[PDB]
Curated annotation (Swiss-Prot), chain A:
Domain comment as written in the entry: Contains three extended channels that together form a T-shaped, three-channel nexus. Contains an active site base originating from the second monomer of the dimer.
Outcome following mutation: residue 265 to A/N: No change in substrate hydrolysis rate. Cannot form the beta-keto acid product
Species, as recorded: Xanthomonas campestris pv. campestris (strain ATCC 33913 / DSM 3586 / NCPPB 528 / LMG 568 / P 25)
Site (described: Important for activity): 265
Family from the record: Belongs to the thiolase-like superfamily. OleA family.
Protein name, entry field: Acyl-CoA:acyl-CoA alkyltransferase
């Protein structure tokens, strides 16, 4: 019932080049903090984000995804002519029409057989994109797929910061919009393939999803604004994950001790610590880049997986859980055997 | 001689289908009256909406209707058509161009409105006017595998804002001829919504079967039509030329995998961008225009909802019979072209 012949041929990530530290942001927001009587460092100390990266001026989501895709093609040692499907999974998008995938695909020079489209599902979309690609691979529709994701937070920072340094900004608004300053830029891409083409490549098994769509108002993001009930998002997200983990026990045969790495989408340091404690996950098996890069939306999971690969942390046979709670609320859990 | 499936979908059916027509009519005559001083300044003497593009009216929602609201209205009607409750739905995919937010998916909001169960998988697909077909295929792969029993594919489009802002821009005393021509196709869009319930065929033995189909792309043309919530710029001339070239490629694939010959299909449900573009398409492939229902004249171009709205109207009008082979065809910005078959 799980995927039998679906592999990961290549994986890459791109770190955005400009550092914006929380110290620097705080220097700018300090007058407003004081007026609200905030007092704590809600970014560095509470959320646990000390920096994030921003792109150069005028870098679009498609530019970032293209850079990651070129690097993933090199990692897979294949040319773009082999790609039969390119799915863009980012929250950021160039336009409503056409798909950002078509723009990345044009940049890369895909063939006329290549099917492309975007999937949107907040932070879980890269996993959805992997599942969608796996189903096509398993059925023999394509041999290789690219799943790409470029996130830009430049505008949300610029706008939120303006809309927070106006003296006349208010306090409900303030806490509602704080989570926007935990976002970061970055990009990732993955080449997936039919297993008989790539012996020795990691195997993607697929996984489980549960949802709690009654909570779809808890985090609403646009190009220039994100509004988020952080507290409620944490509790309801972890309750949802409890259902999903029960599901994963049954269909994936999961037991926490037997998994070798947990690659977890991160919203905040406390959210992550709550999640880890809830499931009794060894925190050593959880790589985190949130402190320096913040929340890179649906690129977070593959950027961390790529970093684990580049560091030499993954060995043959390792059982790797990809986990995340996405705005929706949705929770997806999936396995890769390295 | 043993033959394979050609990777077409097996045992996937259409259990229910519905559309919503938006309530307010905006005529091209009214639009022309507003644009008249600009037409006169630019020397435009023909009715480029009514006579050239072939659109006499389009429907609009109220200002406060979101994509998710339109989609939910369609989904409720589709569930009734399938005679199933929302608790049977294991997948819901929203395919619209219009979006409530970047995050979360419009799908999650439609799903919350409808009250889907905690087993329901949801997400959005975006692919300009072909996304509903992408949605059907994604759902089909899951239903064929037997992972779910029923899926909803939903799409609500709202063009209110693009009308309001485009008309403001085009009535500016300073609008240039170039920007006027660039924005003109935005005045051919319309609001509306569609939804479809798909199911494993074992559950609905006498329902229409969805076979899937083929796609080809020409992504070097991804700049030809670009749209955001308040503006759409379109190179209509090149969309015509490159779109037809791409459809010819896709038609070759459809012959090979679907075994299509135009004379053997009973209906063609074609995504429409304009009357002359449709006429060129039909003429290019030798399609019988009597088998092509059009709503463009009175509803305009409803984006990815166009194909399912027209299929739903065909069903409602009593134009579809058991055994009819229905071609779903379209060229969408990208450029992409997809061709798929439903056997009624």
């Amino acid at each position: 019932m799980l995927f039998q012949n679906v592999s990961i041929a290549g994986l890459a990530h791109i770190d955005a080049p400009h550092t914006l530290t929380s110290k620097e942001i705080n220097e700018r927001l300090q007058p407003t903090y004081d007026r609200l009587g905030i007092k704590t460092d809600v970014l560095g100390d509470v959320a646990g984000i000390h920096a994030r990266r921003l792109w150069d001026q005028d870098v679009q989501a498609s530019d970032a995804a293209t850079q990651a895709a070129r690097k993933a093609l090199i990692d897979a040692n294949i040319g773009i002519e082999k790609i039969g499907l390119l799915i863009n999974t980012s929250v950021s998008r160039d336009y409503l029409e056409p798909s950002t995938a078509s723009i990345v695909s044009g940049n890369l020079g895909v063939s006329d057989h290549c099917m492309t489209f975007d999937v949107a599902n907040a932070a879980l979309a890269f996993i959805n994109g992997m599942d969608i690609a796996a189903r096509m691979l398993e059925r023999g529709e394509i041999d290789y797929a690219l799943v790409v994701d470029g996130e830009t937070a430049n505008l949300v920072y610029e706008k939120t910061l303006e809309r927070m340094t106006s003296p006349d900004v208010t306090e409900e608004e303030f806490r509602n919009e704080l989570a926007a300053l935990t976002l970061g830029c970055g990009a990732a891409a993955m080449v997936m393939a039919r297993s008989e083409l790539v012996p020795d490549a990691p195997r993607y098994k697929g996984g489980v999803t549960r949802s709690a769509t009654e909570w779809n108002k808890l985090c609403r993001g646009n190009l220039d604004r994100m509004v988020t009930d952080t507290r409620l998002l944490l509790i309801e997200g972890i309750k949802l994950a409890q259902k999903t983990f029960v599901a994963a026990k049954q269909v994936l045969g999961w037991a926490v001790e037997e998994l070798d790495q947990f690659v977890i989408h991160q919203v905040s340091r406390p959210h992550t610590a709550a999640f880890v404690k809830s499931f009794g996950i060894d925190p050593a098996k959880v790589m985190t880049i949130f402190g320096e890069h913040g929340n890179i939306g649906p690129a977070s999971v593959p950027i961390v997986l790529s970093k684990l690969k580049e560091l030499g942390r993954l060995k043959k046979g390792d059982r790797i859980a990809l986990l995340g709670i996405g705005s929706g609320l949705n929770c997806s859990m999936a396995e890769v055997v390295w």
